[PDB]
């Protein structure tokens, strides 16, 4: 039998199964093959089109094809044109979502297939889904690279640009998930999904630097991408790779994100452990279940409640459905990985479960269900009973996605094609080939990091450069580089904003956002003129920490590490450094000399750096091109001077020279009269900015902080820090110690958080805004470079940290009055923050250590499993400080590693006023957990009262001191706090005595 | 654009004027008229027009055709440059002899030949002593290699250039025939010092202070080392006369 | 031992064996390493 017979068999299979139900009006396949359903999905039709394209490519190998490939190619093109037309029908939603990402403005994903219009409201489906758009873009670029023609005019290029800009911000907004249910509770909440972000990373990587018209194109067929978004996407993936979601330990949806459709996880070992875990935990006799405890279209369900009631999911376990389609995906992964043994075993497994038509055509049903007779018997022994086929397994109903994947699996299995043909963009590469790939691996090899970066020395003024030359320092004035130009970062921002404008539809282009160091590290050419920019850390900033040399040295070292670790583009990066004359300012001129001498030496903290003349470096280097533009103490107090008249405050402001008095008088004038008032020097805002800049020049930290609080200006980096804190798994609350606090559980827009923090600031204090900014940026930097330092802490509260550090400073002061924190330079505040955040050692009072640990809300490792296992072996429950935690709901709603149990136990434990009391409690809980797990014979008879135990332990400790040192009964247990938990007579001994006294009775 | 028209016209004029007698393989242009000779000074000076034209093309190329034009102009320049270098590197014995003592008999020939780069005259039929030609040659060599063309390939050429540096470093106390190859004012030529040669050599020695011949991808031994006292002596001699 | 040692060994082998007898006037190697052929 020649190839003609098998190819004709595949043709008749496709005609009888896939192409039979195509809609000629639109070209989109429907979700249901019977009953005249008007609902159509995006994934199914795209998969069918991909299968048809694969079959056409397979049949292309015959010169006498008789036009069969013609029909398949035009069917794929018609499907692509229909889906693009439907996407481009909705234009307002794209623009709205580009500015304010919300479910209301999300692009619709379900629409009537007869006329390409929406048929259902967004209040019943959500409609927010990005994996579909990413997969559509990936398949479209794949088909263009194959040799097909998909786009006609320039407007579609602008639409693709706007879609790329739209999907660049996927790493923050939560998604409803591939299964549309999202959380396992199915209550109406959105959670982050690793599969969507992985698909987005793959699509952004593929779309970079590609001609869209195919064979022909000069300057209007390219796509521009930002490396910063790609870096954030890869960071989010690497952080969230082990667990798909906070509420899902594992899911079956991970396979497509980490197999043929994506091919994104280039780490082998974590790929191996992930595949092993998913296979071990999701394997079934009839296929792969969606996830554990999945109540998805099972026997017990009823069609009257969209959202599941609490504790029903517990009853829903054990009766999960089986989807044999994933056997096909594993077959595909095996056949690309060159492991025939998996091919044979999986084909043998899928052989009996497959069904036949009247003519014997293969059938793959959707899901498998158990009859109502075996509802309880299957629970005792998993898999003894035999399930029953679904409705789409006998006749009249099919699953187009299923037969498409089946036929593509058979086409790959029978060797009629090769892996290269079906993947023309080399998405998958072997371990021996990953040597000189772009945007994935460096030229030095995967397990190597020895990059050399270039630096350019440019001065500002002739006086500064001659002064540096007198000491042997070589630097060049900006007037000697006339062929080259140096421009700030806002020029590139406005240039990028100019791009992506269309008049017929109405598009705002790329939003005005800051450009990262990686983007500015390149060299640009506009209007034929070379433009080079320096990092944002160098420009003038109103804030105060930019005036400290140690801050700049640490920041530039961090930037050098960042450029070293996250650079993969061909060619050495370019770094620009500018020295200012006011920086030397007399005595502080030594550290810059040391830093520049180290820079001239060649190595900066283990990083190799090369320095030479700028024109030499720019010559012989690749320059990025932008051709779009051508085509297109105080003596004044608040209370005493509050009631003074306006003329008196004006004259006092005029005749006073103290900075603090001037600032406070300006504040009184602003709060009483307003910002529009006119004073001796012009407007009130003008005086505020002028005195603020004067204080910044003179470096009065209290004055600059007060002026910055007046200016109501905020740093443009809070959002990355809050997003990274959320993605790590920690919690951050904004507020003041002893006052109201706001908890943030999901990412929010900058406007809302700014309004909340400014309202709190107006309520309580004056300089806490800038202090919180400084602490949050320092916390972000210390957690970014030293993540292990924050082990054990989950809720990061700025007020408790500032109180703890103030207490530590007061302790250090001793007899000397405690130094005010508002007058401290950034150097000592970062030093003291690192000191208090240290793991801490002995020598100091244990009460202070317990105070610091409790203020940080530190928890011991493995505490959460310990309290859960206590609860499993606590028939009644635990009451702490008036809070009740019944065992039935927590055992019937949650599981071992679920984070909701963590938040509930933390909420229960957070009512303790004294944090030292809290750490006494947590130590007692650790002790009781240990002593219980070491002996299973002894069990509790009723609920334990931790207050009772701690009080009797205090009584025993008091009796011990009374007998030993002859100390009378003293109120408060600070003496118990001072005693270390371990030693000759530690707190652990008293707690254990508590445990035995409670168990024995 | 107008600039394109002007550059095309200038290229046409240069092509019709000087490039028509480029004499490939050897790369040495004839020294005008029907003389069948190649004077080093004229060959060095006749490349500045092509050089400036190519640099004008390079910055505004932005197209395959203009990229190719700049490429071919630079390759013609390096051809002519290597053609000059070969004739001297073929004659290391004379420079080695000149390195000790000063005499006209042990001096480099001033008029090299066409194809096969041979000698045309002996040592008693012409004035074979012109420090200005070698100095200005090395000056343009330094300028071109600072621009970014690779001219030097083998490391032995570095040693030859270092030897030539010592060959020309004694120009402040060595009498030469002169730029006009006519000796002093009257004939029956007697060697006599002139300010032109010393002034030409001072900048040539200054240019090669640290300028490496391997570009940005050099090594520990890629820079020509020069002293400083000879430059000051040349400056003093020039100022005096 | 990193690649530097092996590559330096290859460099010294090449310098002592192959590039030692190169003729700078033409860049062509001779057929005999002795006798001035």
Curated annotation (Swiss-Prot), chain B:
Muscle specific. Isoform 1 is predominant in vastus lateralis muscle. Isoform 2 predominates slightly in heart, and it predominates clearly in the other tissues tested. The chain holds residues 5 to 245 of 1223 of the full protein. The gene is PHKA1. It is found in: Cell membrane. Although the final Cys may be farnesylated, the terminal tripeptide is probably not removed, and the C-terminus is not methylated. Phosphorylase b kinase catalyzes the phosphorylation of serine in certain substrates, including troponin I. The alpha chain may bind calmodulin. Belongs to the phosphorylase b kinase regulatory chain family. This is Phosphorylase b kinase regulatory subunit alpha, skeletal muscle isoform. It is linked to Glycogen storage disease 9D: A metabolic disorder characterized by slowly progressive, predominantly distal muscle weakness and atrophy. Clinical features include exercise intolerance with early fatigability, pain, cramps and occasionally myoglobinuria. Hexadecamer of 4 heterotetramers, each composed of alpha, beta, gamma, and delta subunits. Alpha (PHKA1 or PHKA2) and beta (PHKB) are regulatory subunits, gamma (PHKG1 or PHKG2) is the catalytic subunit, and delta is calmodulin.
From Swiss-Prot, chain C:
It comes from the Eukaryota. Although the final Cys may be farnesylated, the terminal tripeptide is probably not removed, and the C-terminus is not methylated. It is found in: Cell membrane. Belongs to the phosphorylase b kinase regulatory chain family. It is linked to Glycogen storage disease 9B: A metabolic disorder characterized by hepatomegaly, only slightly elevated transaminases and plasma lipids, clinical improvement with increasing age, and remarkably no clinical muscle involvement. Biochemical observations suggest that this mild phenotype is caused by an incomplete holoenzyme that lacks the beta subunit, but that may possess residual activity. Phosphorylase b kinase catalyzes the phosphorylation of serine in certain substrates, including troponin I. The beta chain acts as a regulatory unit and modulates the activity of the holoenzyme in response to phosphorylation. Hexadecamer of 4 heterotetramers, each composed of alpha, beta, gamma, and delta subunits. Alpha (PHKA1 or PHKA2) and beta (PHKB) are regulatory subunits, gamma (PHKG1 or PHKG2) is the catalytic subunit, and delta is calmodulin. This is Phosphorylase b kinase regulatory subunit beta. It comes from Homo sapiens (Human). The chain holds residues 43 to 79 of 1093 of the full protein.
